[PDB]
Each structure stands twice: as C-alpha cells, then as structure tokens.
Curated annotation (Swiss-Prot), chain B:
Subcellular localization: Mitochondrion
Keyword set, alphabetical order: Mitochondrion, Ribonucleoprotein, Ribosomal protein, Transit peptide
Family the UniProt entry places it in: Belongs to the mitochondrion-specific ribosomal protein mL40 family.
GO biological process: mitochondrial translation
Protein name, entry field: Large ribosomal subunit protein mL40
Keyword Disulfide bond among UniProt keywords: no
Interval of the full protein contained in this chain: 34 to 146 of 147
Species, as recorded: Saccharomyces cerevisiae (strain ATCC 204508 / S288c)
Primary localisation category: mitochondrion
Function: Component of the mitochondrial ribosome (mitoribosome), a dedicated translation machinery responsible for the synthesis of mitochondrial genome-encoded proteins, including at least some of the essential transmembrane subunits of the mitochondrial respiratory chain. The mitoribosomes are attached to the mitochondrial inner membrane and translation products are cotranslationally integrated into the membrane.
UniProt miscellaneous comment: Present with 6300 molecules/cell in log phase SD medium.
Domain of life, per lineage: Eukaryota
Cellular-component GO terms for this entry: mitochondrial inner membrane; mitochondrial large ribosomal subunit; mitochondrion
From Swiss-Prot, chain D:
Entry-linked NCBIfam families: rpmG_bact
Misc. remarks from the entry: Present with 2500 molecules/cell in log phase SD medium.
Family annotation (PANTHER family): 39S RIBOSOMAL PROTEIN L33, MITOCHONDRIAL, LARGE RIBOSOMAL SUBUNIT PROTEIN BL33M
Source organism superkingdom: Eukaryota
Keyword terms of this UniProt record: Mitochondrion, Ribonucleoprotein, Ribosomal protein
Descriptive protein name: Large ribosomal subunit protein bL33m
Quaternary state and interactors: Component of the mitochondrial large ribosomal subunit (mt-LSU). Mature yeast 74S mitochondrial ribosomes consist of a small (37S) and a large (54S) subunit. The 37S small subunit contains a 15S ribosomal RNA (15S mt-rRNA) and 34 different proteins. The 54S large subunit contains a 21S rRNA (21S mt-rRNA) and 46 different proteins. bL33m stabilizes the tRNA acceptor stem in the E-site.
Organism the protein comes from: Saccharomyces cerevisiae (strain ATCC 204508 / S288c) (Baker's yeast)
Record function comment: Component of the mitochondrial ribosome (mitoribosome), a dedicated translation machinery responsible for the synthesis of mitochondrial genome-encoded proteins, including at least some of the essential transmembrane subunits of the mitochondrial respiratory chain. The mitoribosomes are attached to the mitochondrial inner membrane and translation products are cotranslationally integrated into the membrane.
Keyword Mitochondrion: yes
Xref: InterPro entries: Mitoribosomal_protein_bL33 (IPR052008), Ribosomal_bL33 (IPR001705), Ribosomal_bL33_sf (IPR038584), Ribosomal_zn-bd (IPR011332)
Swiss-Prot record, chain F:
Protein's recorded name: Large ribosomal subunit protein bL31m
Gene that encodes the chain: MRPL36
Region named Sufficient for general mitochondrial translation: 17-66
Keyword Lyase: no
Range within the parent protein: 20 to 95 of 177
GO molecular function: structural constituent of ribosome
UniProtKB/Swiss-Prot annotation, chain G:
GO cellular component terms listed in the entry, alphabetical order: mitochondrial inner membrane; mitochondrial small ribosomal subunit; mitochondrion; peroxisome; small ribosomal subunit
Organism ancestry: Eukaryota, Fungi, Dikarya, Ascomycota, Saccharomycotina
Family the entry assigns: Belongs to the universal ribosomal protein uS13 family.
Subcellular location(s) of the protein: Mitochondrion
Keyword set includes Amino-acid biosynthesis: no
Role of this protein: Component of the mitochondrial ribosome (mitoribosome), a dedicated translation machinery responsible for the synthesis of mitochondrial genome-encoded proteins, including at least some of the essential transmembrane subunits of the mitochondrial respiratory chain. The mitoribosomes are attached to the mitochondrial inner membrane and translation products are cotranslationally integrated into the membrane.
Gene: SWS2
Protein name: Small ribosomal subunit protein uS13m
RNA sequence: GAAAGAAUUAAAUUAAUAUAAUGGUAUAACUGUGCGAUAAUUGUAACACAAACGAGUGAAACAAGUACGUAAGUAUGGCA
RNA sequence: AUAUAUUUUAGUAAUAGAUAAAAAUAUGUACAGUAAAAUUGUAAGGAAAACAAUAAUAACUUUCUC
C-alpha cells in the first residue's frame, strides 16, 4: 500500500480534509458527501449503487501499479526520466486528483497543490495547455504581438500579470485587455509559473514589457519602447510572484514607465515577454549577467537584437493594450513626462 | 380528429420518442465524481492491458508459424507446398457454436454423422 | 458583405489553438460524451459481450492461422497512374484515372497479429416502398427496427425522384440503424440462433454476395421478422411487418476472409464462391 | 404585379419612414432600424393597414 | 428570320495598375470577375472581387509560399521591399498622421471626445 | 392522397444538453430448443422465454448430430 | 379468439369445429378428438379458453400434420404422376377435368382451381 | 508491438452555388450548425474604374447606432 | 380489501446530434465538415427506390506493453 505511506513521499499527495478522505475510503456507503454542505441537500442526494467495492478494487489496482512504478523510479539516475516515472506512479492517485481539480491552481496553497511535486506540476501544465495557453497564443497571433516584436513563442511558463498598486482592486489581467491609464499608472506584478523540470537554484529569468506601437514621425512608421525591464530574477515553483519584495534595484535594467498613449495615435499593445537565462556548467550558484545600460535605449529598442546579445529564450508572454483617455495627461504629469502629442483623427 | 390507425401510429412513435419518458440528469458530488473517474480510468487501463496481452499472444503465434513454415520449406518442399495453400472457401464447422450463458441438457455428443 | 474572398492568414506559432475551449458558450459540450459530467453520458461497458468474447478466445487465433501465407507481400490496388513526361503538356496534368476503375482501390495487406479480420459494424436498412402512399408505415418500420435492435433508428428519406415508381423527393420512407459493439453482437447472435433457423427453405448467405473489400450482406422478408422475440412477444402490434437489408461490415481485407469470419459466428454459406 | 411597397413608420413619433418592398401577403412586417431624427435604433411598424393571408397559429402546446 | 444580333459591351476588366507602380489608398489594382488574383499584403478586395489600394506604395504581383496555387497582388509600402515578404519578422507599418502642431488644432481634437 | 401525421413545432434540443436514448430494457432468459439458457437484454416485458425452433434443433446448424 | 396459432378465431365460436375452419391440416373428426385429448367440455366457445389451455391447443396441432404443410404433400403427389406420363398431369397442368368430368362443358371449375399448385 | 489522436499528402471546384453563361470557389463562396433576424442602418464620402454627357462600378475613411464573436474581429444585403 | 376527499400522473409525437449533400429561409455572425461520379454488393429490387464499402500512412504525440 504505497499511497498510504508518507515516509519518503510528500504530504501534498494526501487530501488535507479529513472528512473527504473518510468519505473516499469507507467499507459501506453509509456516510454523506462533505461537498454537499446543506443537510436537506445531503438527505436528497443519493450516490450511485455498488460504487464503493468497485472503487476500492480500482484503488488497489492503481495503487499496485504505482508501487511497481516506484520500484523502477528509485533505480533511475537521470532526473527527467525519474520525474516522468514519479508522475506515472502518482497521476492516477484519487487524492492528488481531488487536490488538483477542486482547489485553486493560480494561488496554490503549498500543502494542497505543491508545484515542487512533479505530478502536481504535470497536472498544472496539462490544465494550462487545455485553455489558458491556447488563449494566450490566440491573443498573440490576432493582435500581432509575435512577428512585430519577437518572431515566435514556444509557451513553457504560464505568465499572469496584475496591477495591485495603482487602484486597489484585485484582478489578474486577461490577455489582450483594454486597461485604463489609471489602472496601469503604477507598475505590474508578474507570476511566472514554470511547469518544466528546471534547476530552481541556478536558473535566472528576465522580464521585458515592450510597446511596439509608439509612432515615429521621421520614419512615418512605429518604433518599439521598453516600458519595463527586469533581469536576473529567481523563481521557485511555489515562490514565483515577481514583486518589489523579491527583485532588487540592481535587477531593474529599465524601471517602469507607464502606458501614455497619444490622442488618435491608436491602440498600443504592451506585450510582456519572459525569458530564461543561459545556464553555464562548472559554476556553482546563480550565473548573473551584466547589461550595458548606455547601449540599450528605451525610446527605441530592438528586442530581437537584445535577445541575440544575451542569448535569451522566450518561455512566456502576456499582453494588454492601452489607448488614450482623459487621465493619461494626469499620469504624464505625475511621472513628469511632457504634455503629450495630439494627432489628426484621419490617417491620411 | 384522428383515426384508430393514426392513434396507434402515434403510440408507436411515442415508444421511440424521448418525450416525457426520461429522468433527471445524473448529478454527482465532487468526491463521488472523483471516485467515478478512478473507476473508469482503472477499467480502461485494465482493458488496454488485456488487449496488449491478446495482441502479444497473436504476435507470438504468428512468429511461431513463420518459424515453422521456413523450417518446412528447408526440409520437405512438398509438405511446405501442402501447408501453404489458398484457404479461400474455408468455413468454420457448424458444431463450433458461440458459447451460451448456461449449458444445455446434453453437454456433449459422443456419437455423430 | 464587402467581399466573398476566403483566405486563411498564416500564423507565427506551432501551438494548436482549440477555438471551442476559448469560448464560454457550450460548457456542457466541452466535456467528452464519455465523461460522467456530460448530459450525453451513457454507460457503455455494461455487461460482458458474449460473441466478442468467443471471437477473442477461439476464433481470432484460428483465423490468423488460416490466413497465414508464407512470405506474402502487399498487393497494391488500382491507383491513379501518373503520366510519363514524354511531352511538355504532361507538366501540370492531372494523373490518369485507374486502369479498370474510375475510383482508386485499396492495397490488400498480408494478415498478421494486428490486422486479423473481425466484425466492425452492422447496418439495418429498411426502405418501405408502400410509404410513398402512407407516412405512418415509415414510423411503424422504424419502431420495428428499434424493437429488434434496442438501438435508436434514423429515418430514411427519398433522395431521388422518379415517375414509374410513384416516388417523390424528400419523403420519409422507412429507417436505418448502425449497430456497433455489444448491441450489434447481440443482434448477430439473435439472427444466428432465433431468426434464421425459423426461415423454412434457408440455405444460407450467398457466396457471391458482398463488397470487394470486407463487407457482406443479405435481407429478410416481412415473413422473417415475425421470428424476432420482441415482435413475437406482440405479433398483434406487428400485422404489416416490413422487410430489411442487413449490411455487415468487417475489418477484412477481402471478402472471402469476411465470409470465413462470419462462418465462425455460425452463419451458413451456400452458393458457389467467386 | 407580384411585389408592392409599404411604408415602415417609426415607433418614436418622428415621422421618419423607411419604405421597403414586400410580397402581396406580407407577414405584417416590423423591422428594427435607425431613426436619424431620434439618433437611436427603434422598431418600424407598417403605416397603412394592409392584410396577411390566414397564417395558422403554431401549436407549441399539445392539443385536440 | 430571328437574328442573334445581341451581345453585351465587354467589361473593361483587367489589370488597371501594373507592377512597380505607385498607387494610393483606394485605387483599383485589378478589376476581375473571380478571385483570379487574391488580395495580398496591404490590399483590399471589393464586392466583385475587385482588388483595391489600402496603403500608398508599390503594387507587386507575387506568388506566396504559404498559399500555393494562388496569386496575389499586394502593395508594399516601399519599392525597396519585396512583397512576398518574409514572414517571421516585423511587419512594415505606416502611422499616417500629422501631429497637430497648431495649438488650436490640437486643443480642438483633444478637448473633444 | 398521401396519408401523413402532420408535424408540430419541433422542441429545441440545446447544444450540450442532448441526452442519449437509453431505452428501458429487461434481462430476458432464452432457453433454446435444448436446455441451454442464454441471457439477452430486451425491450418487451418477459423475464423468461423458451424457444421451439432454433439453430440447436435445425439440421443445417448441426449436420453431424395444428 | 386471440392470435391462437397465429390466424386465431373469435369468441362465442364453439372451438370443436372452429379448428376445422381456420386450420387446414385439421378438420371434422380430427378437430373433434383434438379437443378430446385436451379435454375441453364440448359445446365450449373460444372466449372461454383459459389462455394456458390454448398453449396445449397449439402444441396439439404441432403434433400431427396441419397448415399448408400438407398442401404441398398433395402438390407433390400431383406433380408425381404429373412428372411421370400421367393423363392427370395433363388434365391438371392444362387446367382440365382431373376427375375425368365434363371437359366438353362443365369444366370451368377445373380451369378455375385445378393447376400445378392447385390449393391456392 | 498495439491503440488512440492529431492529422499530412494525394484527389477533387466534375458535386454544389437563389437563376443563364463565363469567371471563382474545398484557405472553401459550398455544406451543417448556434445565435440572431441586426449592417436588406444613418449623415459627410477621398479616391480611383468606367466614361461624351446623363448615368454606372469598387471603395479607404470620419461620424451615430445595431448585430454576432473569448477574442482578432466581421457585417452599409446575396461568390461576381 | 375497500369507500370519500384531495391531488398527482397519463393530452402518450419524432431532432438527443454543433447534426453535415433528403425537404424545409437565399441577408448577418460564429463554429465545424466535405462533395459528385463511378464499381462490388444487398427482401421484394429491375437501367432507373434506399443502404453499405471503395487513396496513402512518413513523421509527431499520448497510453499499454514485451
């Protein structure tokens, strides 16, 4: 009985609720489900017949399978293979399924869904692939944030942004949203959730918010603008919210300048990109990198060139898009930016 | 309004139709839903295993046949030729019946023709 | 509409966007029909299928043994022939259609452990021709079919028009039902045991019957349908019984293999084979 | 003479009319379009009172 | 005797703006009856499948690797460019506006929602 | 001339809400010509049937054996 | 009265002869004692039959030879000589006095029914 | 080794498309479908195409509102 | 068992599928799929009802498994 053992196995694989666990594992269908909170509703409810004995048999079967997998898993040396074996062992565990399905994945509590555990991480990845990743990809393609900034994306990390400091309200930004200048007045907060097996201690990350749609009237086209640039950020599967708490002033290659779209300049895409650092062998600890702060410019910014220079690989992305409103002038004034231009309504 | 034949047709139609004959939807609790999922997944896995076992057995049989026929070809050409014939109109014998739920009164016939 | 020009734009990523999942319109429809949470849920594997079990145990190995031909290579079918490039008019020319046929024919593979012939699907086509006069006859035929099978029939409509036979276009006329898996197996077992023996001068299924590739068929008269136990139960409610065609579809490469398979399930075969 | 022209008047008392063409038995038409005068969409009912072929009410409820 | 003396004045329907040519937003690059030529980069296709100018540039009839067995007629925003544009790259884009440098002009545009 | 049942307005089955037709079926025991019993699911209400003319007493299906 | 032996009958109808009527393989004396073995009080009508009883009724007819099953036996006895050199076969095949009756005149009857599968 | 999926190539525009004939069509215009039934809306239309004129044809865009779509969006009647 | 009230049922009717080349609406939008012909067939069935079958699997992923 491998799934009842918790000597070597993490605590997160068990259900933390006692009542739920008891309901799952009983000898007869006597008890009533903890999910149904209301007595009258519990009374009304009737579970399907014979479900218990069969369930128990299924558990035994899959428990045996897990145990067999574990016999292989411990003998394995290479890490990715071992992780895969662990996943195979525990993915069919009812308790872990309960934990994952019916508790929040975004702000996961460590005791319930631990992303340090490989199985839970795999589940989270699968969940991301099912909806959120696809949506992100659609928003990147439709809005034309991929070819315009950075050729392609192979989504690996799930990136979610927030604007907590400006207004007060709590809301994770859906990709391709129209945010007010009040909302995006102060800086955002990232959460880079990584689902691949990666060296947590060594692996650093960079985050770049880029505005491809600021108008350049000499060229009669647009230019990029690095609105916010962080480097050498340390992520951990559970500890992953990039906040002023975590990153230091040394990490900020270009400190947050807010979206201030001009009147009739149009809708401006702000597409955050998340890259992971190149990992160097034969060097213990996190390998930093120095950025030439005079070389990179904010008013015009070759993202692709920058990536080429520092050998980055874009793992994640997110995007919002701002256009002119009444408060952009106020935002500019607060930041000490100039009055802000006004263009002709007609694109002649 | 309607004839007796028309009425009977309507009744017949109703027998087939889902109009006011079907129950409520099968709702489950989350724990119950999980239990169901675990039952189904395990079953599916078991079925796959069984399929592989049978498939493997069939492959093994095929390999054995191949091994036999090569040997036959090597040794006795006439015997090999006899073995490897077109069995186009081969018919299973009508005595090899599909096994019933419960057996008959006379289990086995000792005399024939 | 400013234009009718259809032109799908290329993309800049290899992620496969399932558009259905991004909507919030059909939340019940996002679940698979196999899943318990879907309203489309049905218990599939309710009991042990008997004919299928028999096939698995006894027949499949026997069939494999029968079909072994030593060092048998693939027989390619009739395909679209390319032009020899002996003229510059061959350069963007469509390929010559197949030799005998207009449509391409499939390759016949050697039978191994993977591709042993087995039952794939049964279809019970009942087109009642008196229903050109009476629509109610189509309904009765559909009911009969349902009774026989335990499966939901689908209505057949008159696809064509013709004056000689008093037939309009778009008129409900009989019904069909594709049986698959366990219900189909049951239906076959009933046919073998109950119904076909009660047909008086029944020699069997013809050996000249069938597709070129793994499909065999036959038909039952209105006299033959009264032997089904569900109709037998209330023959009173089945005065005007209707005949039916029975298309058996196998996983057989060729038709003789399919015939052999059916024989394994106690179907008699009488005529001179092709 | 198989088609004619009616005079879809605007619910809002504006006078705006959107003359459209209809078959002889025109299911009393009612279209929701823009009333420039009142700067908003609004329903347009027929003006002169014509006629509709006896159209049977649909039997949504089972009867007789 | 009935005389088939009737026919229709042919429709001027061909390229109307040729290669390397300099168009302007909204010009007819090719009347056609049929999508013989499909709208391509920076061009628009009208009701009759007529192809028109969206950006002021240079018309370039070019095939396309993505869409095979088809032919486009686009309008790069500049001659130096080759309209069978790469793909995985930035897309040329044109801003098209003159910043109201007039105080009054800018004020009116801004003050007015 | 053509005898018909005239259709009422059809009931809108919404997408996702369509449910599979699970007909009411009884487990029915068929005893064949000889004493071999076989269970089959059947829509008609009869728990037991015994058959007179079957494959198990037809000469075509077993050549060797008012 | 019900679907007895398929083509059944009606109530009020005393069974004894009723069988002689619908059934072709049985009639008169045969139908008489057919009830006798099944022991049903004579002068008894169909409506009174206790369904289970009909069951016996059915089996009984299976025992002896009934229905068009015998129609054929004669059909063959006819075809027999007919297939051999048999005046009858001509008389029967041509539709003429098989009983050597009035071919010259009263023979329409023969022409009406006498034929290869006579009993039609 | 097997299943299952995702599909990919070939073939096809001979089917079909409200209707002639041609042109186009599977990247589908064609077909099924949900919703809806609104853009088979309302002011300025540049600019071309065609063109003697009167007329006609495409139509960027600005503005007001409607509809469907997660969204990109699309819609100022219909493949032309 | 059975009687009175009270109600509830039974007005018996098709599509159960994002359906897909039978007939139904031909403008919008959104999602999804591919046709016809021909040949081997098959109760009546036939030149002409309906129905079934009629190209290729490299690679890729997932699952089981020796």
């Amino acid at each position: 009985h491998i799934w009842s053992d918790f000597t070597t196995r993490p605590s997160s694989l068990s259900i933390q609720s006692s009542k739920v666990k008891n309901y799952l594992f009983q000898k007869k269908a006597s008890l009533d489900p903890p999910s149904i909170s209301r007595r009258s509703n519990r009374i009304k409810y009737s579970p399907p017949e014979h479900i218990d004995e069969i369930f128990r048999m299924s558990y035994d079967f899959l428990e045996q399978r897990s145990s067999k997998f574990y016999e292989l898993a411990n003998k394995t040396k290479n890490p990715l293979k071992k992780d895969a074996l662990l996943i195979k062992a525990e993915i069919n565990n009812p308790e872990v399924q309960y934990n994952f399905q019916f508790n929040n994945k975004l702000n996961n509590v460590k005791d319930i869904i631990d992303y340090d555990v490989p199985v839970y991480r795999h589940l989270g990845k699968q969940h991301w692939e099912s909806y959120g990743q696809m949506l992100l990809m659609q928003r990147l393609e439709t809005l034309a944030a991929i070819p315009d900034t950075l050729p392609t994306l192979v989504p690996r990390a799930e990136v979610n942004i927030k604007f907590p400091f400006s207004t007060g309200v709590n809301k994770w930004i859906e990709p391709g949203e129209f945010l007010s200048s009040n909302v995006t007045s102060m800086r955002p907060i990232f959460k880079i959730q990584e689902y691949e097996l990666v060296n947590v201690e060594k692996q650093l990350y960079t985050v770049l918010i880029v505005n491809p749609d600021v108008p350049d009237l000499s060229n009669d086209s647009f230019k990029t603008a690095l609105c916010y640039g962080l480097v050498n950020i340390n992520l951990t599967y559970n500890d992953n919210l990039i906040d002023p708490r975590k990153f230091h002033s040394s990490n900020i290659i270009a400190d947050y300048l807010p979206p201030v779209p001009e009147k009739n300049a149009g809708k401006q895409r702000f597409v955050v990109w998340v890259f992971r650092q190149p990992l160097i062998e034969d060097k213990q600890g996190p390998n930093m990198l120095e950025i030439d702060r005079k070389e990179l410019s904010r008013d015009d910014f070759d993202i692709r060139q920058f990536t080429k220079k520092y050998n980055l690989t874009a793992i994640g992305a997110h995007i919002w898009r701002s256009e002119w409103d009444a408060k952009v002038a106020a935002v500019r004034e607060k930041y000490g930016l100039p009055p802000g231009r006004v263009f002709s309504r007609v694109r002649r | 309004s309607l004839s007796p034949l028309a009425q009977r047709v309507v009744t017949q139609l109703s027998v087939m139709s889902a109009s006011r004959k079907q129950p409520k939807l099968l709702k489950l609790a989350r724990e119950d839903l999980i239990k169901h999922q675990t039952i189904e997944k395990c079953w599916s896995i078991y079925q796959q295993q069984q399929r592989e076992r049978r498939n493997l057995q069939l492959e093994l049989q095929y390999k054995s046949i191949e091994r036999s026929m090569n040997l036959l070809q090597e040794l006795s050409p006439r015997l090999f030729e006899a073995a490897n014939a077109s069995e186009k109109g081969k018919r299973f014998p009508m005595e090899m019946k599909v096994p019933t739920d419960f057996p008959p009164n006379t289990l086995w016939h000792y005399n024939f023709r | 509409p400013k234009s009718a020009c259809s032109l799908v734009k290329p993309v800049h990523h290899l992620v496969k966007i399932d558009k259905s999942k991004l909507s919030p319109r059909f939340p019940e429809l996002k679940y698979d029909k196999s899943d318990i949470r879907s309203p489309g849920f049905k218990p599939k594997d309710t009991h042990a299928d008997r004919l299928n079990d028999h096939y698995l145990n006894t027949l499949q190995s026997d069939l494999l043994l029968i079909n072994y031909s030593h060092n048998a290579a693939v027989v390619k079918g009739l395909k679209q022939r390319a032009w020899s490039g002996d003229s510059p008019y061959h350069l963007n020319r469509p390929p010559k259609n197949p030799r005998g046929s207009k449509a391409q024919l499939p390759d016949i593979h050697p039978i191994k452990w993977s591709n042993i012939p087995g039952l794939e699907s049964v279809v019970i086509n009942c087109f009642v021709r008196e229903a050109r006069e009476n629509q109610l006859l189509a309904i009765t035929a559909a009911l009969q079919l349902q009774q026989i099978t335990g499966c939901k029939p689908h209505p057949i409509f008159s696809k064509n028009d013709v004056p000689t036979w008093k037939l309009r276009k778009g008129h409900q006329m009989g019904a069909k039902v594709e049986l698959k898996g366990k219900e189909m197996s049951q239906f076959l077992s009933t046919l073998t045991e109950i119904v076909l023996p009660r047909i008086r001068e029944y020699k069997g299924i013809s050996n000249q019957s069938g597709n070129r590739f793994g499909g065999i068929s036959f038909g039952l008269t209105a006299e033959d349908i009264k032997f089904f136990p569900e109709i037998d139960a209330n023959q009173d409610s089945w005065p005007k019984t209707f005949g039916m065609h029975i298309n058996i579809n196998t996983s057989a490469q060729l038709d003789y293999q399919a015939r052999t398979l059916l024989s394994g399930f106690q179907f008699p075969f009488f005529g001179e084979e092709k | 003479s198989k088609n004619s022209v009616i005079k879809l008047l605007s619910t809002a008392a504006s006078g705006y009319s959107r003359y459209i063409s209809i078959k002889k038995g025109a299911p009393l038409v009612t279209q929701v379009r823009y009333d420039p005068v009142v700067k908003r969409h609004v329903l347009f009912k027929e003006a002169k009172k014509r006629k509709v072929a006896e159209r049977k009410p649909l039997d949504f409820l089972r009867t007789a | 005797s009935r005389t088939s003396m009737k026919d229709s004045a042919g429709r001027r329907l061909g390229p109307k703006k040729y290669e390397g040519q300099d168009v302007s937003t909204g010009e007819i690059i090719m009347r056609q009856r049929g999508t013989k030529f499909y709208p391509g980069e920076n061009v628009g296709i009208g009701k009759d499948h007529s192809i028109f100018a969206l950006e002021p540039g240079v018309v370039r009839y070019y095939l396309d690797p993505f869409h095979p067995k088809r032919k486009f007629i686009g309008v790069a925003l500049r001659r130096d460019l080759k309209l069978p544009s790469p793909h995985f790259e930035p897309t040329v884009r044109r801003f098209g506006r003159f910043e109201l440098t007039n105080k009054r002009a800018a004020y009116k545009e801004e003050n007015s929602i | 001339t053509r005898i018909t049942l005239p259709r009422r307005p059809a009931k809108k089955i919404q997408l996702g809400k369509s449910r599979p037709a699970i007909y009411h079926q009884f487990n029915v025991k068929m005893e064949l010509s000889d004493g071999s019993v076989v269970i089959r699911r059947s829509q008609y209400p009869k728990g037991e049937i015994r058959l007179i003319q079957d494959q198990r007493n037809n000469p075509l299906w077993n050549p060797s054996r008012g | 009265v019900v679907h007895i032996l398929g083509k059944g009958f009606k109530g009020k109808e005393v069974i004894k002869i009723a069988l002689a009527s619908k059934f072709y393989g049985i009639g008169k004396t045969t139908a008489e004692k057919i009830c006798s073995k099944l022991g049903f009080y004579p002068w008894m009508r169909m409506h009174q039959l206790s369904e289970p009883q009909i069951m016996s009724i059915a089996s009984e007819l299976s025992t002896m030879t009934i229905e068009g099953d015998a129609r054929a036996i004669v059909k063959d006895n006819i075809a027999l000589k007919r297939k051999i050199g048999s005046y009858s076969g001509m008389r029967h095949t041509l539709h003429l006095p098989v009983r050597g009756q009035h071919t010259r005149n009263n023979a329409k009857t023969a022409r009406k029914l006498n034929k290869i599968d006579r009993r039609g």
